[PDB]
Amino acid sequence: SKLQTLKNELIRAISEEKNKTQNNFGFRETYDQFKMKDSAFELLDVISYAPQLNSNTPEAENERNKFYALMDFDQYKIEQFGSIMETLYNENQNHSLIRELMISGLGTQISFELALEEINKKIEIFNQDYLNAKINSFDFTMKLKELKSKLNQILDKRKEWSRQADGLIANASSNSSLSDSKSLAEYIKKRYLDNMQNARQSVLEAYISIM
Numbered sequence: 186s187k188l189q190t191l192k193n194e195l196i197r198a199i200s201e202e203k204n205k206t207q208n209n210f211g212f213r214e215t216y217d218q219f220k221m222k223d224s225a226f227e228l229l230d231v232i233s234y235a236p237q238l239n240s241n242t243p244e245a246e247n248e249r250n251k252f253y254a255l256m257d258f259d260q261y262k263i264e265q266f267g268s269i270m271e272t273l274y275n276e277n278q279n280h281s282l283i284r285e286l287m288i289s290g291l292g293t294q295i296s297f298e299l300a301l302e303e304i305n306k307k308i309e310i311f312n313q314d315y316l317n318a319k320i321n322s323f324d325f326t327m328k329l330k331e332l333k334s335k336l337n338q339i340l341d342k343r344k345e346w347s348r349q350a351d352g353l354i355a356n357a358s359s360n361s362s363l364s365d366s367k368s369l370a371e372y373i374k375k376r377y378l379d380n381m382q383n384a385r386q387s388v389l390e391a392y393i394s395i396m
Contacts, residue, residue: 224283286377
């Protein structure tokens with residue numbers, strides 16, 4: 186059935202994405218938390234009082250792992266990103282930038298994961314509405330199309346954050362000028378920060394629109 190196929194394909198897509206939010210690679214956090222124990226994670230508390238994000242507590246390990254999940258548990262990229270945060274941290278005029286960068290990434294992954302579960306919940310609710318004759322096949326199809334559009338949006342904007350991080354890693358590595366901490370902070374602020382915050386906000390708005 187056209188309707189059953191559409192519904193099952195969306196359920197499968199959510200399940201595939203939920204599976205990827207878990208470390209299925211034997212990935213393990215280094216003792217210095219990829220140079221962020223004494224830099225980016227030191228500057229924040231757990232956001233999802235609360236313990237510091239660099240702390241040896243299960244709550245902080247869980248939240249650091251959301252950043253690792255955002256980076257697809259890629260040890261190389263996480264180490265590169267942490268090394269750039271460490272460089273930025275050398276000047277305390279850069280600490281607010283480091284906070285904004287990490288908050289934009291954590292918030293992207295947190296909203297992304299909440300949106301996956303919200304879509305899953307809505308599928309089941311609409312399904313029972315359909316089974317109870319409250320809505321018809323057309324109505325259910327329209328809602329599934331809308332949920333799939335919202336899934337595509339959170340996937341695309343989470344990928345956009347990662348694309349900005351990839352360019353930042355590639356550029357702060359191979360651009361010699363970016364070795365100076367102050368120059369690097371200015372460069373990142375003008376090239377990447379707004380794009381990363383705009384991606385975070387877009388995932389959040391899609392999440393809210395599903396509820």
